[PDB]
Amino acid sequence: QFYSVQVADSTFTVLKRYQQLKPIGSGAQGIVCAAFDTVLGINVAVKKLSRPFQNQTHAKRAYRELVLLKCVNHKNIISLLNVFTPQKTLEEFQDVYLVMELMDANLCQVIHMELDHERMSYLLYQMLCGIKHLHSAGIIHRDLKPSNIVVKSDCTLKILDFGLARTACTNFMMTPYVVTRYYRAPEVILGMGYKENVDIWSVGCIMGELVKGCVIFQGTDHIDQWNKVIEQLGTPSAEFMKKLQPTVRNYVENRPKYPGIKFEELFPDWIFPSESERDKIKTSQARDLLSKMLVIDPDKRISVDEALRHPYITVWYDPAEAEAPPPQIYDAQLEEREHAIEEWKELIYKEVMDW
Numbered sequence: 001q002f003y004s005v006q007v008a009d010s011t012f013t014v015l016k017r018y019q020q021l022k023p024i025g026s027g028a029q030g031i032v033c034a035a036f037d038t039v040l041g042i043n044v045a046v047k048k049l050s051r052p053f054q055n056q057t058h059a060k061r062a063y064r065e066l067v068l069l070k071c072v073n074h075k076n077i078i079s080l081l082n083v084f085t086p087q088k089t090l091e092e093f094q095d096v097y098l099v100m101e102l103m104d105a106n107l108c109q110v111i112h113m114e115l116d117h118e119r120m121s122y123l124l125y126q127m128l129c130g131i132k133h134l135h136s137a138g139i140i141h142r143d144l145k146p147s148n149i150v151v152k153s154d155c156t157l158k159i160l161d162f163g164l165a166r167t168a169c170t171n172f173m174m175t176p177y178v179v180t181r182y183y184r185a186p187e188v189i190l191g192m193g194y195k196e197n198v199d200i201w202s203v204g205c206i207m208g209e210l211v212k213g214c215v216i217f218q219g220t221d222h223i224d225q226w227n228k229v230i231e232q233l234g235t236p237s238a239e240f241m242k243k244l245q246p247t248v249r250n251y252v253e254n255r256p257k258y259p260g261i262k263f264e265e266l267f268p269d270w271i272f273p274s275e276s277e278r279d280k281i282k283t284s285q286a287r288d289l290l291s292k293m294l295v296i297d298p299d300k301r302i303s304v305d306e307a308l309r310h311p312y313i314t315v316w317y318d319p320a321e322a323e324a325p326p327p328q329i330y331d332a333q334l335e336e337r338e339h340a341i342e343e344w345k346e347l348i349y350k351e352v353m354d355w
């Protein structure tokens with residue numbers, strides 16, 4: 001297993017099977033290169049994490065995502081072809097390389113391509129399949145947005161990361177690009193506490209964006225985000241508001257009361273194909289599902305299991321993908337403990353050596 005070094009902005013030491021390294025982006029966790037794997041005969045993406053153990057946030061993210069790849073195994077979630085380090089001992093250990101099949105684009109790039117119903121409904125289906133698989137493994141993503149999701153030109157899709165640990169003191173973030181509130185569920189903006197269907201809200205916002213071509217709830221701060229939500233969906237019920245913490249409830253109950261816009265005006269026929277018997281049906285189904293995902297009160301928001309059975313999605317439904325439990329449930333207790341930087345180094349190195 002001899003290595004080759006190639007400077008690509010920084011410097012990439014990789015097994016020689018990986019040829020033609022080309023930069024294609026920069027992740028929160030490090031530099032991504034495209035490459036060709038001459039052993040497998042396929043294009044791959046190669047990501048280098050430099051000293052993931054140096055920073056605590058980077059350590060918990062590197063460690064939990066290494067472990068989670070042993071818990072999940074699903075076509076719509078990142079799975080790794082290879083994990084390696086070029087350093088030969090624990091204490092010269094610095095760099096972890098992750099290898100997966102090369103994806104063509106991120107979802108943030110497909111937003112402006114005005115997809116038809118067949119492609120929109122297939123992307124939605126795959127998102128729901130991956131999320132159901134993540135939930136079954138004990139993972140609520142909590143930070144799904146267009147940039148967390150990559151696609152190939154054949155419209156296949158993978159959720160790229162495992163989201164936000166509950167014990168993340170970093171609120172709701174990590175940065176390839178500009179941190180935004182656009183996809184965060186209202187219960188999260190309001191400080192309420194969250195359940196799994198926070199991920200359904202995010203998927204609704206993404207689906208709305210690919211229908212409309214623009215961001216559905218484009219708040220410019222925490223306060224403006226809530227306003228953009230109630231302006232379009234209506235002020236939620238008194239029960240929901242009463243359950244807020246008094247200071248939040250005081251502010252929220254004092255806003256202008258909005259009635260909400262019917263989804264037939266929010267998502268009218270003219271932003272959909274809608275131009276045939278078949279497309280009028282699909283448009284009605286798409287809008288009905290949107291009206292069940294984009295629901296402020298999480299107790300009335302559709303679940304992933306329910307969304308997966310929706311008529312808009314049936315053309316794609318395949319139990320081999322939609323009813324596919326994960327190899328293991330994640331044991332989070334080990335990620336929540338303190339761990340010094342040198343403990344993280346050992347923990348990460350061990351996982352790297354398990355490959």
Ligand SMILES: *[C@H](CC(=O)Nc1ccc(C(=O)N2CC[C@H](Nc3nccc(-c4c(-c5ccccc5)nn5ccccc45)n3)C2)cc1)CN(C)C
Binds near residue numbers: 078100101178
């Ligand atoms: C707007 C979007 C924008 O302006 N620019 C932009 C957005 C996304 C991308 C991108 O994500 N791409 C293009 C090719 C890349 N292919 C690919 N394939 C597989 C994996 C990755 C990848 C990995 C990774 C993980 C594990 C092993 C190997 C690789 N990690 N990351 C992190 C970030 C991005 C990709 C990636 N990539 C996908 C390019 C340009 C958004 N704005 C509105 C917020």
